[PDB]
Amino acid sequence: GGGGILDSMVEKLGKLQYSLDYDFQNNQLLVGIIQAAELPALDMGGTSDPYVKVFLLPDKKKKFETKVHRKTLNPVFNEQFTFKVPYSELGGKTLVMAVYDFDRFSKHDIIGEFKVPMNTVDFGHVTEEWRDLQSA
């Protein structure tokens, strides 16, 4: 501080709105990747090409991904994903949502991410919230 304290604050890397609900009838976790807001601008007044990867840890299965939305810092994804996992095995896992900037010719930069531990989720009601993207 003062600079040290400022440096510790959460950087403005945008926010993601998502929903989550466990379907006890079909025994699957339903995830809605709704929209992102205020993604950071690129240099020289440019915008990113955001998409979201959605997956469970420690599961090593291939991560799900939304479609890529071109040149926008405020994408509306409106996509749903399903994870076939019996409830009893869900409490030890962690749902990860990570927003990337698509590029055809170079490694895709990560914009930010956040994690939702299953043991923190309120099972029985649909979850819906905005989460600030965390650095790496």
Coordinates of C-alpha atoms in Angstrom, one line a residue:
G1 CA 0.0 0.0 0.0
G2 CA -1.1 2.3 -1.0
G3 CA -0.1 0.8 -4.3
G4 CA 0.3 -2.6 -2.7
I5 CA -3.3 -2.5 -1.5
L6 CA -4.5 -1.4 -5.0
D7 CA -2.5 -4.1 -6.6
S8 CA -4.3 -6.7 -4.4
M9 CA -7.8 -5.7 -5.6
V10 CA -9.8 -7.8 -8.1
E11 CA -8.9 -6.6 -11.6
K12 CA -11.7 -5.5 -14.0
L13 CA -11.6 -8.5 -16.3
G14 CA -15.4 -8.8 -16.8
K15 CA -18.2 -10.9 -15.4
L16 CA -20.0 -14.0 -16.4
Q17 CA -23.6 -14.9 -15.7
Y18 CA -24.4 -18.6 -15.4
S19 CA -27.1 -20.9 -14.0
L20 CA -26.9 -24.3 -12.5
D21 CA -29.4 -27.0 -11.5
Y22 CA -29.1 -30.6 -10.6
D23 CA -31.8 -32.7 -12.4
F24 CA -32.6 -35.5 -9.9
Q25 CA -35.0 -37.2 -12.3
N26 CA -32.3 -37.8 -15.0
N27 CA -29.4 -37.6 -12.6
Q28 CA -27.4 -34.9 -14.4
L29 CA -26.0 -31.5 -13.7
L30 CA -27.4 -28.8 -16.0
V31 CA -25.3 -25.6 -16.6
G32 CA -26.4 -22.5 -18.4
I33 CA -23.7 -20.2 -19.8
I34 CA -25.8 -17.1 -20.2
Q35 CA -23.8 -14.0 -21.0
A36 CA -20.6 -12.0 -20.2
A37 CA -20.3 -8.4 -19.6
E38 CA -17.5 -5.8 -19.5
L39 CA -14.7 -8.0 -20.9
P40 CA -11.5 -5.9 -21.2
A41 CA -10.8 -4.0 -24.3
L42 CA -7.8 -4.9 -26.4
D43 CA -5.1 -2.4 -27.4
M44 CA -5.9 0.2 -30.0
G45 CA -9.7 0.1 -29.3
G46 CA -10.1 -3.5 -30.2
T47 CA -12.6 -6.1 -28.9
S48 CA -12.0 -9.8 -28.2
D49 CA -13.7 -13.0 -29.6
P50 CA -15.0 -14.6 -26.5
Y51 CA -16.0 -18.2 -25.8
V52 CA -16.3 -20.1 -22.6
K53 CA -14.9 -23.5 -21.6
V54 CA -17.0 -25.4 -19.1
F55 CA -15.9 -28.5 -17.3
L56 CA -15.6 -30.4 -14.0
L57 CA -12.5 -31.1 -12.0
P58 CA -10.8 -33.4 -11.3
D59 CA -12.5 -35.1 -14.3
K60 CA -10.1 -35.3 -17.2
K61 CA -12.8 -35.6 -19.9
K62 CA -12.8 -33.1 -22.8
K63 CA -14.0 -29.7 -21.7
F64 CA -17.2 -28.3 -23.2
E65 CA -17.1 -25.0 -25.1
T66 CA -19.6 -22.4 -26.2
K67 CA -19.6 -21.0 -29.7
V68 CA -17.2 -18.1 -30.4
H69 CA -18.7 -14.7 -30.4
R70 CA -16.8 -12.4 -32.7
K71 CA -15.7 -8.9 -31.7
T72 CA -17.7 -8.2 -28.6
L73 CA -17.0 -7.4 -25.0
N74 CA -20.6 -8.2 -24.1
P75 CA -21.5 -11.6 -25.6
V76 CA -24.8 -13.3 -25.0
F77 CA -24.1 -17.1 -25.2
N78 CA -27.5 -18.6 -24.1
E79 CA -26.0 -22.1 -24.1
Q80 CA -26.7 -25.2 -21.9
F81 CA -24.4 -28.1 -21.0
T82 CA -25.1 -31.4 -19.3
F83 CA -22.9 -33.4 -17.0
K84 CA -24.0 -37.0 -16.4
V85 CA -22.9 -37.5 -12.8
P86 CA -24.8 -39.2 -10.0
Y87 CA -25.4 -36.9 -7.2
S88 CA -23.4 -38.8 -4.6
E89 CA -20.3 -38.3 -6.7
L90 CA -20.9 -34.6 -7.4
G91 CA -19.9 -33.1 -3.9
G92 CA -16.2 -33.7 -4.5
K93 CA -16.0 -32.0 -7.9
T94 CA -15.5 -28.4 -9.0
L95 CA -17.2 -26.7 -11.9
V96 CA -14.9 -24.4 -13.8
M97 CA -15.9 -21.6 -16.3
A98 CA -13.1 -20.0 -18.2
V99 CA -13.5 -17.2 -20.8
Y100 CA -11.0 -17.2 -23.7
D101 CA -10.2 -14.9 -26.6
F102 CA -10.4 -16.9 -29.8
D103 CA -7.6 -16.4 -32.3
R104 CA -7.0 -18.4 -35.5
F105 CA -3.2 -18.1 -35.6
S106 CA -1.9 -17.9 -32.0
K107 CA -2.6 -19.5 -28.7
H108 CA -6.0 -18.3 -27.3
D109 CA -5.4 -15.9 -24.4
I110 CA -7.4 -16.6 -21.3
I111 CA -9.5 -13.6 -20.3
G112 CA -10.4 -14.9 -16.8
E113 CA -12.0 -17.8 -14.9
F114 CA -13.8 -18.8 -11.8
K115 CA -14.6 -22.0 -9.9
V116 CA -17.8 -23.4 -8.3
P117 CA -17.1 -26.2 -5.8
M118 CA -20.0 -28.7 -5.9
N119 CA -20.0 -28.9 -2.1
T120 CA -20.9 -25.2 -1.9
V121 CA -23.9 -25.5 -4.3
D122 CA -27.4 -25.2 -3.0
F123 CA -28.9 -28.4 -4.6
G124 CA -32.8 -28.2 -4.7
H125 CA -33.0 -24.7 -6.2
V126 CA -31.8 -23.3 -9.4
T127 CA -28.5 -21.3 -8.9
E128 CA -28.0 -18.1 -11.0
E129 CA -25.4 -15.5 -10.4
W130 CA -22.9 -13.1 -11.9
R131 CA -19.3 -13.9 -11.1
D132 CA -16.3 -11.6 -11.6
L133 CA -13.7 -13.3 -13.7
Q134 CA -10.5 -13.9 -11.8
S135 CA -7.0 -13.6 -13.2
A136 CA -5.7 -16.9 -14.5

